[PDB]
């Protein structure tokens, strides 16, 4: 499992002067992904008579 | 004689559905001939002799030829009483016997 940074998002505007205030902007997003592992197998056999 | 010099060997090493043993050696031929393809005669005379023997031996008359010379074991009347041999069919069919 691993994390992913979706987007940083906008934080802070070019606000005017003489304004005792500010704007919360918009927070980003951080997703949390994960992935499995798959297996690969098979079979093969003989007759043990020609093998000798 | 199968020529020991092999022309190819198409083997299939490694398998679990048939365990790759072998497909057996097979052979095709003909044992035919001409428009006179075969003759079942020659072995018809023993058949006819067996027929006549079974006509004139319905099964109550004691008939027995002897194989071994000394005796069998006990006081019994030998024995070969079979048919197709006391009539001459076996020694006429032996000509077509391997």
UniProtKB/TrEMBL annotation, chain A:
Membrane-crossing residue ranges in chain numbering: none
Superkingdom, natural source: Viruses
Protein's recorded name: Major capsid protein
Organism of origin: Agrobacterium phage Milano
Location of this fragment in the whole protein: 208 to 259 of 465
TrEMBL record, chain B:
Taxonomic superkingdom: Viruses
Protein name: Head-to-tail connector complex protein
């Amino acid at each position: 499992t691993y994390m992913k940074i979706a987007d940083y998002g906008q934080l802070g505007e070019y606000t005017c002067d003489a304004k005792c205030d500010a704007e919360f902007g918009e927070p980003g997003n951080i997703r949390h992904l994960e992935g499995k592992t798959y297996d690969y197998r098979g079979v093969f056999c003989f007759n043990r008579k020609n093998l000798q | 004689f199968f020529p020991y010099g092999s022309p190819d060997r198409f083997q299939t090493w490694g398998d679990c559905h048939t365990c790759d043993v072998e497909s057996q050696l097979m052979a095709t031929y003909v044992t035919g001939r001409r428009c006179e393809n075969s003759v079942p005669a020659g072995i018809i005379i023993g058949i006819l002799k067996l027929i006549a023997w079974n006509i004139n031996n319905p099964g109550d008359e004691v008939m027995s030829v002897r194989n071994t010379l000394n005796a069998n074991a006990q006081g019994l009347i030998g024995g070969t009483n079979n048919g197709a041999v006391i009539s001459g069919a076996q020694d006429e069919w032996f000509r077509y016997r391997r």
